[PDB]
Amino acid sequence: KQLSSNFGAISSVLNDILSRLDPPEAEVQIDRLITGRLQSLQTYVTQQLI
Amino acid sequence: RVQPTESIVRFPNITNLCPFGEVFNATRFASVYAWNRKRISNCVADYSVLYNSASFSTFKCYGVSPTKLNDLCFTNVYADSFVIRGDEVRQIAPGQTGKIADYNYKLPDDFTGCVIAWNSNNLDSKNYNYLYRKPFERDISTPLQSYGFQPTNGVGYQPYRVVVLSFELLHAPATVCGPKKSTNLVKNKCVNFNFNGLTGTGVLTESNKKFLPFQQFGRDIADTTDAVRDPQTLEILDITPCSFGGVSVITPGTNTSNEVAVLYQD
Amino acid sequence: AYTNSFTRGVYYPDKVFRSSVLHSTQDLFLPFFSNVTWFHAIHPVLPFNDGVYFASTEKSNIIRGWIFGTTLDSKSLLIVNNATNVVIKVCEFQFCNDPFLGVCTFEYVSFKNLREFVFKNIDGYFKIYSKHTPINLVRDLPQGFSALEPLVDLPIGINITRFQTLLAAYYVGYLQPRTFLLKYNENGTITDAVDCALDPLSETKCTLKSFTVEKGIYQTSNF
C-alpha cells in the first residue's frame, strides 16, 4: 500500500512521471518518490530485524 | 529479468485532424470575464504544431512537457479563450492573485496543462470591447471596467490573446489522442506496451475479467495496472509481469576450482 | 414527509475497475440511514447544496426529468424523457411556476421500477451517477443495496443552488464528504459499503479495513 503513496509527487506511478514530464522536473519528482519509498523500506527492514 | 522482446504502441482507430484553426486563428476572442471555453474531443491532436510555432509569445506547460504532449492521449481538452492585457500574462499561473487572476479568471493550483499566448496588437487594437473586473468561475453578472487597447500604446498595454489548454488527466477511456502510429498487439510476450500513455512492461494474456463499459483499465492493490482494455478491440487483457528472480552463484571456492553453478531464484 | 435512506446512495467513485478488494474511498456521498424528504404527486423547488441523492420508485415513469440552476427561468439544466427518448438541453428555457409535462451550449438526443440518480457538480463538471432496477413495492424505498454508475459528465460551468423534479413518488437527499469503505466482489461490482463516520461500529470497521470485526478493544479516532 505504501507503493501507492505519492510523497508529494504528481503520481505514485513512475512511468506516468517519465512519460509526462521532461527529466529536469521528472528527476525531482522521482527523487521525492525514491525518498518516500526508501524511508518506507528502511522502516520495514527495521521492523523485520526487530 | 526477462527482457522485453518487442514494443506495442496502441491507440484507437481515430484519424480526425483536430480543429485548432478555429481556436488559434479565430476572428474573434472572448473577454477575460466572459472567457470562451471550447470543448475538444475525439481527434488526433498534434501539439507539436503549436509548440514549434514561433508566432506565440509564451509557452508554459506545467503538468506535462511539450515534447511529451504528442506521446499522451487525453480524455477531455478545454481551451479557455480570452483576450487579456499583456501585463496580466504572468497572472495566468497556478496559485496567484490579481485583477484577472482572482476575479475574472481563477486557475487551479493543481493544474495540468499548457498556457499559450501571443500578441494581438495588429488585430484587436484600433478598442474597448474586452472588459475585466473558486476555479473556472465565469461570472458575467453586471461594475465592469473595459480595456483601453490602442496600437500606439506600450508593450504592457498591448492586447494579447491567451488560450489556456487545460487537459483532463487519464482516469477513463480517453478520446483526444496525439499523432502516434498504432501497432499490432502481440500476446504472450514481454512487450513494452503503450495504451494511450499507459506505458509499461509485462506479458499480455487474455483475461476473463468483466469491466464496466465506462472503465478503461483495471488496477491492483499496489496501484498498478492489472488489466487493460484494447482501444481497438473490446477485450479485457491482463498484464502479467515478466518473470524475474535473483541470481545465486554456487561456488565451491576458487581454492578448489573455477567451475560454478548458477541457481536462479523461483 | 420523510423516509429512511437506509444503505443507498453509494456510487462508483472513479472509472477504475477493482475486484475482491476492500477499497476505502472519500467522496461526496449520501450518508447511511439519513433523513431524506418524501415528495408525492397526487391530489416544488428544492435546494441543491453540495450534491443531491435522488431516488424515484416509478410505477409508470411519470417523472421524466429535472430543472437545475439558481433561478431556473430564462437565466439552467433540463432533462426531458418524452416517449422513449431522453432529450436533454441546457438552454435558458421559459419554465412555468409549477413546471409540468402534458399527457443552449449542449443538446443530446437518445411501484415497478426504481430509478436512482446522483446529481453533483465538481468545478462545473456535472457528474451524474445512475442505476435503474426493477422493484415490487408501493410504499417507500425498499431495503436494499445497488451501486450507481457514472454515465453522463457535463462541464456545464453553471452554479446550481436549486433544483426541481418534473413529472410515482420521489425522494431527495444530499451528499456529504464522508469516507466510505467499499467492498468489490469477485465480479468487480460494489456489493457492500461502510460509512466511516456513521456509528462507532462502522468507525471500527473503517479503522480495521474489514467488514468483519472480531472481539477486542480497538482505538478508532480522537475525541
Swiss-Prot record, chain A:
It comes from the Viruses. Changing residue 6 to K: In strain: Omicron/BA.1, Omicron/BA.2, Omicron/BA.2.12.1, Omicron/BA.2.75, Omicron/BA.4, Omicron/BA.5, Omicron/BQ.1.1, Omicron/XBB.1.5, Omicron/EG.5.1. Residues 1-30 form a coiled coil. Subunit of the fusion protein that is processed upon entry into the host cell. Mediates fusion of the virion and cellular membranes by functioning as a class I viral fusion protein. Contains a viral fusion peptide that is unmasked after S2 cleavage. This cleavage can occur at the cell membrane by host TMPRSS2 or during endocytosis by host CSTL. In either case, this triggers an extensive and irreversible conformational change that leads to fusion of the viral envelope with the cellular cytoplasmic membrane, releasing viral genomic RNA into the host cell cytoplasm. This is Spike protein S2'. It comes from Severe acute respiratory syndrome coronavirus 2. The gene is S. The chain holds residues 964 to 1013 of 1273 of the full protein.
From Swiss-Prot, chain B:
It comes from the Viruses. Changing residue 57 to F: In strain: Omicron/BA.1, Omicron/BA.2, Omicron/BA.2.12.1, Omicron/BA.2.75, Omicron/BA.4, Omicron/BA.5, Omicron/BQ.1.1, Omicron/XBB.1.5, Omicron/EG.5.1. Residues 85-87 are annotated as: Integrin-binding motif. Disulfide bonds join 18-43, 61-114, 73-177, 190-242. Changing residue 222 to D: In strain: Alpha/B.1.1.7. Changing residue 157 to H: In strain: Omicron/BA.1, Omicron/BA.2, Omicron/BA.2.12.1, Omicron/BA.2.75, Omicron/BA.4, Omicron/BA.5, Omicron/BQ.1.1, Omicron/XBB.1.5, Omicron/EG.5.1. It comes from Severe acute respiratory syndrome coronavirus 2 (2019-nCoV). This is Spike protein S1. Residues 1-193 are annotated as: Receptor-binding domain (RBD). Residues 127-133 are annotated as: Immunodominant HLA epitope recognized by the CD8+. Changing residue 99 to T: In strain: Gamma/P.1. Changing residue 122 to K: In strain: Omicron/BA.1, Omicron/BA.2, Omicron/BA.2.12.1, Omicron/BA.2.75, Omicron/BA.4, Omicron/BA.5, Omicron/BQ.1.1, Omicron/XBB.1.5, Omicron/EG.5.1. Changing residue 13 to Q: Reduced viral infectivity. Changing residue 50 to I: In strain: Omicron/XBB.1.5, Omicron/EG.5.1.
